[PDB]
Design a protein around this ligand. Structure first.
Ligand code: SF4
Ligand code: SF4
Ligand code: SF4
Ligand code: SF4
Ligand code: FES
Lengths: 688, 106, 21, 82, 109, 207
């Protein structure tokens, strides 16, 4: 292929044309000092810290900007380059405030580290230091703008990755100021990432403000559970305390960003958390009791009952191990009526084929696509990183986004085809204009969010999408490898439950009111005590005591995602396993352990007593639940569409509106979100 | 001198202490300042090196002139924030005099 | 004992237990 | 009581070609003939094709489907249903 | 490469020498160190410690184990190792934790 | 001149390089690598089998009278196939010079005892065995030296936890100082101080 020969410190390296000096240095292994350069963002060249010497060149060039030329010897560690770095660091530090003892970036400060390595050891600035004002930018980010290095990283992130375009550089000269000119609240589902962006602890988190230091905190790698995207996470902990949540890089999903919910709802783990088993709802006084008492009573009731009288409702943020173990328990009791709160149509192929309930195109494939058709979604406020990927495509790989939903601000420009369901049939018949855009397209995407499927017409909308997407496949030549049907999920555990074989929806409970209910981490209130008999011995396995637990006979404390190495599968089918970061609070235990102990106290006894054996049973139920960080391919959507064609329903005339019309809606959905206080401040601010 | 506590929970003393005796947990007060909810020194693990008062950026932690504090039970030697602040208040004048005498040498 | 106030006890966590309504 | 029946397979491997052919020819017909009974088909890379039947009270039996032709797969499916 | 034994058989011969040494020593050890145990208990403890490493099959590992056993035998003979050290082998103050899954769940994690 | 930079000289470097070549060519059978550091410290690496020959040569040869054994140390490097790296430091009073001899070993690979050459080794070798677990053949009296009378481990190994596995206490029930599994009120705080940026360009390992 076409490559150029360049030298770094007299050593040859081949680089594709246009690669920057910084990128060639990275290739050879050297890491040039930088501040204003971010690989995800655009190039700025403002800091001038990456200045380097090209040999036999008179003037030092900026390594982050210069696209290398052939036969260039990049003298990284020349006297010229070192003195350039010295001068740049001097000017950076001249006006800085004396805040290192009182600065959240204390131990991680790149300014500190690069002054240490590539910086002088003495100051010769014998004048006064500039002073900048602070301005409330919202309830989440606190701005100490006196210590800005004016690097414009926050502005570039705001205008590119988020599209908010609220932040800017106002003024000129040393009196420059990076911030909103008016008193505005910087509120984006991706706002928090600015905190990690900015390299001089200027704009930092109000919640976490001043708690711990990097040399203290212990970091364990975990996967988010507050959204179906499964954004990889690092949980910073001290002495069992969860200090903060930080992004972990995963090119396919995270790309070094995380949602504000994901990074600021951790506080919910601290308030109103379960700790002790409880019993005695009949008398009305739900009191604490020993594991012996609670488990024995549950096992006794289970022995009394059986068949279709028992059932369970898994929902929200429950894990695959707990799901499979409860499924095994209820099946050994002879049931199969275990259900999930979320509603996915079961009229046709249902859950038998993963091609029906998955994002086949994959978030990575969202970049490759050319026309994406959004139906029944407000993707900005549900799976925000998916919207981030779409905006990335729109900005770089020019893409056309067409939406069949209420007009919302998806950050990018979208062709609001209509807010009606029969528009899908219009496209399928070819009556609509957007069909011409399809004919143009060589890689189409039709993405359908579970939000609409929750409607009463879920089967009708699913069949409409299926027929329309098959029509797209036949009319527009699409390679068999490329998948054009994909589904967006807003609940973390839905895909895992369906892969296991849980019955989607809760129609079974209402059709046959169970005598005993097993509410597993479900406080959605979909099944209230109004249904079921006058006494139904409802048992709650979960955490945070949301509100759904109260109206249950016995409460068994569980562990949140920060304390258990659960298996969580994201919307694209990939399996990711959390890592224990904090021991479960008080007496709380892991859910698979809980269910196995309950069974053994009962006559039944599950085959497994360890995480390895539970994972083996998981592999048994489905094989893709144990291939971690792997996206197993799906097919036979042809057969799915055949069954969908046979399925007979009709799309209502009700306008299709996404549940989340505003960030106020986004900021509280889960139990942890409801129990978190910072989210309350955010919602209050947005409301006013 | 007003009454405010000098320590601002920078935690450099904790970071440097050779024997790992200092344990600090701080939170942002109502105003927004750094203040230590708990500041605990295990005087049976401390080696009296002085590296804490060496590295305290605001001269908050200081090793007073007192040397007579033998206790009758092991649990009295685990100093806490209240005990340390009371010691500072008690020895303020002499601590201040020594600091003025020495700061030039430091 | 249980406490609505989250307590940092030595090296441990005690979250806001919250007496259940 | 055949409460649950599931088949595991993989696309790239050769042996699972028989189960894949059986699925392309019969899956839709099987669902039409038996709507209620869940016939979950799961595919994961490099897995020995297997047909797994879960009977009433949490008791299950298994039959290997490696290197079997689609007709043999159909016969096995009929046997497990019967 | 041979640390001392050529294969497993010579290592086992060395092991048998060492076991005979400990078995012969136990009476004198109990008498001299005034232990509160029977000779049968001492020899059964010797056997328990020896069996704890029966699973090892590498000749070099067996050779090193025999080195360390002869080492401790010399200590005991010379009485450098005292009564407390000798009784440490018996663990008469350690309460076992049940391996029952239910009990383990009951007791923390 | 540069007041804060350590003064440098090359005479000693040249002399040590000459002596390094000298020893290497005299003993090609065991010598495997000779290097003279910028600090001016001749450093010979020999095969484990050549310990007695090399040390006897350095002690007895007229032109090399390294009659005093300063140390017999071990450095643990778990990654390398031979974890333990025995270091010998020697001093020649006649020639005002110091030399270092280095060899490798493994848990299952004993090295010969040099007590015959320098009887000073005996106790250093006992410490090496006690702390790192390396065994020495033909040693007069190899036995633990700095560890407890019933210790079971080689503490200086990098795998060994700092606080170990066993702790001692008195128990009135048995009226003896009993040993129990280690439990700590405030566990050791391992601060992660490594800086993301690289510091010393010369020692940059290739990627
Ligand atoms: S506020 Fe921070 S991120 Fe923004 S320009 Fe200043 S230093 Fe850079
Ligand atoms: S950002 Fe500024 S005040 Fe904060 S640690 Fe770095 S240099 Fe110090
Ligand atoms: S004087 Fe004591 S408390 Fe202070 S740094 Fe030294 S050892 Fe730690
Ligand atoms: S006493 Fe001084 S060094 Fe220690 S945390 Fe407070 S300000 Fe920092
Ligand atoms: S990193 Fe190149 S000028 Fe800022």
């Amino acid at each position: 292929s076409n490559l150029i020969e360049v030298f770094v410190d007299g050593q040859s390296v081949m680089v594709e044309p246009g690669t920057t000096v910084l990128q060639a240095c990275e290739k050879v292994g050297m890491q040039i000092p930088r501040f204003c350069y971010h690989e995800r963002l655009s190039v700025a060249g403002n800091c001038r810290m990456c200045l380097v010497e090209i040999e036999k060149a008179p003037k030092v060039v900026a390594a982050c900007a210069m696209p290398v030329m052939k036969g260039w010897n990049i003298l990284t560690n020349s006297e010229k380059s070192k003195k350039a770095r010295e001068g740049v660091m001097e000017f950076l530090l001249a006006n800085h405030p004396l805040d290192c003892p009182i600065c959240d970036q204390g131990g991680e400060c790149d300014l500190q580290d690069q002054s240490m390595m590539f910086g002088s050891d003495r100051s010769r600035f014998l004048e006064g230091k500039r002073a900048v004002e602070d301005k409330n930018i919202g309830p989440l980010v606190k701005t100490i703008m006196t210590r800005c290095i004016q690097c414009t990283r926050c502005i570039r992130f705001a205008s590119e990755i988020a599209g908010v375009d609220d932040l800017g550089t106002t003024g000129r000269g040393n009196d420059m100021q990076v911030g909103t000119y008016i008193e505005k609240m910087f509120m984006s589902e991706l706002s928090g990432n600015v905190i990690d962006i900015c390299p001089v602890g200027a704009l930092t988190s109000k919640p976490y403000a001043f708690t711990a230091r990097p040399w203290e905190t212990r970091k364990t790698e975990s996967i988010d559970v507050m959204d179906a995207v499964g954004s990889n996470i690092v949980v910073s902990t001290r002495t069992g305390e969860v200090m903060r949540i930080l992004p972990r890089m995963h090119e396919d999903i995270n790309e070094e960003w995380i949602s504000d919910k994901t990074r600021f709802a951790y506080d919910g783990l601290k308030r109103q958390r379960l700790t002790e088993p409880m019993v005695r709802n009949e008398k009305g006084l739900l009191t604490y009791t020993s594991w012996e008492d609670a488990l024995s009573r549950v096992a006794g009731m289970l022995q009394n009952f059986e068949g279709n009288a028992v059932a369970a409702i898994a929902g929200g943020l429950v894990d695959a191990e707990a799901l499979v173990a409860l499924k095994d328990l209820l099946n050994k009791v002879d049931s199969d009526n275990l259900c999930t709160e979320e509603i996915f149509p079961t009229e046709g192929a249902g859950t038998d084929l993963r091609s029906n309930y998955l994002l086949n195109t994959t978030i990575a494939g969202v970049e490759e696509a050319d026309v994406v058709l959004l139906v029944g979604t407000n993707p900005r406020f549900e799976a925000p990183l998916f919207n981030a990927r779409i905006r990335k495509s729109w900005l770089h790989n020019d893409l056309k986004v067409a939406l069949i939903g209420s007009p919302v601000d998806l950050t990018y420009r979208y062709d609001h085809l209509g807010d009606s369901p029969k528009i899908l049939q219009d496209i399928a018949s070819g009556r609509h204009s957007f069909c011409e855009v399809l004919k143009d397209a060589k890689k189409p995407m039709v993405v359908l969010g579970s939000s609409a499927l929750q409607r009463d017409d879920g089967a009708a909308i699913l069949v409409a999408v299926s027929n329309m997407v098959q029509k797209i496949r036949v009319t527009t030549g699409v390679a068999a490898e490329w998948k054009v049907m994909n589904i967006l999920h807003r609940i973390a555990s839905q895909v895992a439950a369906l892969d296991l074989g849980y019955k989607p929806g809760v129609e079974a409970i209402r059709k046959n009111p169970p005598k005993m209910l097993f509410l597993l981490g479900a406080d959605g209130g979909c099944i209230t005590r109004q249904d079921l008999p006058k006494d139904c011995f409802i048992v709650y396995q979960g955490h945070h005591g949301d509100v759904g637990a109260p109206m249950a006979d016995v409460i068994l404390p569980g562990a949140a995602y920060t304390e258990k190495s659960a298996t969580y599968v994201n919307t694209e089918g990939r399996a990711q396993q959390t890592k224990v970061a904090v021991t479960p609070p008080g007496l709380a235990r892991e859910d698979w352990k809980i269910i196995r102990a309950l069974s053994e106290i009962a006559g039944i006894t599950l085959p497994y007593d360890t995480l390895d054996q539970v994972r083996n049973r998981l592999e048994e139920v489905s094989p893709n639940l144990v291939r971690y960080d792997d996206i197993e391919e799906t097919n036979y959507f042809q057969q799915a569409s055949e069954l969908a064609k046979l399925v007979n329903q009709e799309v209502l005339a009700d306008p299709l509106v996404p549940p989340q019309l505003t960030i106020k809606d986004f900021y509280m959905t889960d139990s942890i979100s409801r129990a978190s206080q910072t989210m309350a401040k955010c919602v209050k601010a947005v409301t006013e | 001198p007003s009454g405010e506590e000098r320590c601002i929970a920078c935690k450099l003393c904790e970071a440097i202490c050779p024997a790992q005796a200092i344990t600090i947990e701080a939170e942002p007060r109502a105003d927004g300042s750094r203040r230590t909810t708990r500041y605990d020194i295990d005087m049976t693990k401390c080696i009296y090196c002085g590296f804490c008062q060496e590295a305290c950026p605001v001269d908050a932690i200081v090793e007073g002139p007192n040397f007579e504090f033998s206790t009758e039970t092991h649990e009295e030697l685990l100093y806490n924030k209240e005990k340390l602040l009371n010691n500072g208040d008690k020895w303020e004048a002499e601590i201040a005099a020594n600091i003025q005498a020495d700061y030039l040498y430091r | 004992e249980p406490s609505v106030a989250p307590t940092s006890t030595g090296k441990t966590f005690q979250p806001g237990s919250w007496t259940p309504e | 009581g055949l409460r649950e029946i599931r088949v595991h397979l993989c696309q790239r491997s050769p042996g699972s070609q028989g189960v894949r052919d059986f699925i392309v020819q019969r899956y839709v017909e099987l669902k039409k003939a038996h709507p209620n009974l869940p016939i979950l088909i799961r595919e994961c890379s490099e897995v020995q094709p297997k047909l797994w039947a879960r009977y009433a009270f949490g008791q299950e039996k298994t039959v290997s489907l490696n290197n079997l032709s689609a007709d043999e797969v159909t016969r096995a499916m009929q046997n497990v249903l019967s | 490469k041979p640390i001392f034994s050529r294969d497993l058989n010579e290592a086992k011969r060395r092991v048998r020498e060492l076991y005979r040494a400990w078995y012969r020593e136990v009476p004198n050890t109990v008498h001299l160190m005034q232990l509160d145990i029977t000779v049968k208990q001492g020899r059964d403890k010797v056997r328990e410690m020896f069996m704890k490493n029966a699973h090892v099959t590498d000749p070099r590992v067996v050779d090193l184990l025999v080195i360390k056993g002869k080492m401790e035998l010399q200590e005991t003979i010379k009485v450098w190792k005292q009564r407390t050290h000798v009784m440490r082998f018996f663990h008469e103050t350690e309460t076992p934790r049940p391996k029952d899954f239910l009990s383990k769940f009951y007791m923390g994690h | 001149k540069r007041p804060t930079v350590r003064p440098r000289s090359d005479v000693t470097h040249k002399q040590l390089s000459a002596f390094g070549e000298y020893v290497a060519e005299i003993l090609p059978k065991y010598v495997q690598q000779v290097q003279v550091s910028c600090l001016d410290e001749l450093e010979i690496c020999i095969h484990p089998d050549g310990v007695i020959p090399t040390l006897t040569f350095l002690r007895d040869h007229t032109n090399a009278q390294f009659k005093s054994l300063a140390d017999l140390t071990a450095v643990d490097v778990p990654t390398r196939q031979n974890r333990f790296e025995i270091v010998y430091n020697l001093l020649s009073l006649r020639f005002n010079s110091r030399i270092r001899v280095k060899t490798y070993a493994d848990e299952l690979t004993p090295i010969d005892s040099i007590v015959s050459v320098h009887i000073a080794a005996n106790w250093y070798e006992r410490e090496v065995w006690d702390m790192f677990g390396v065994f020495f053949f033909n040693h007069p009296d190899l036995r633990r030296i700095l560890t407890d009378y019933g210790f079971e481990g080689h503490p200086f190994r990098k795998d060994f936890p700092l606080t170990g596995y066993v702790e001692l206490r008195y128990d009135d029930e048995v009226k003896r100082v009993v040993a129990e599994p280690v439990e700590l009120a405030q566990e050791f705080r391992k601060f992660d101080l490594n800086s993301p940026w690289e510091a010393f360009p010369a020692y940059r390992q290739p990627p």
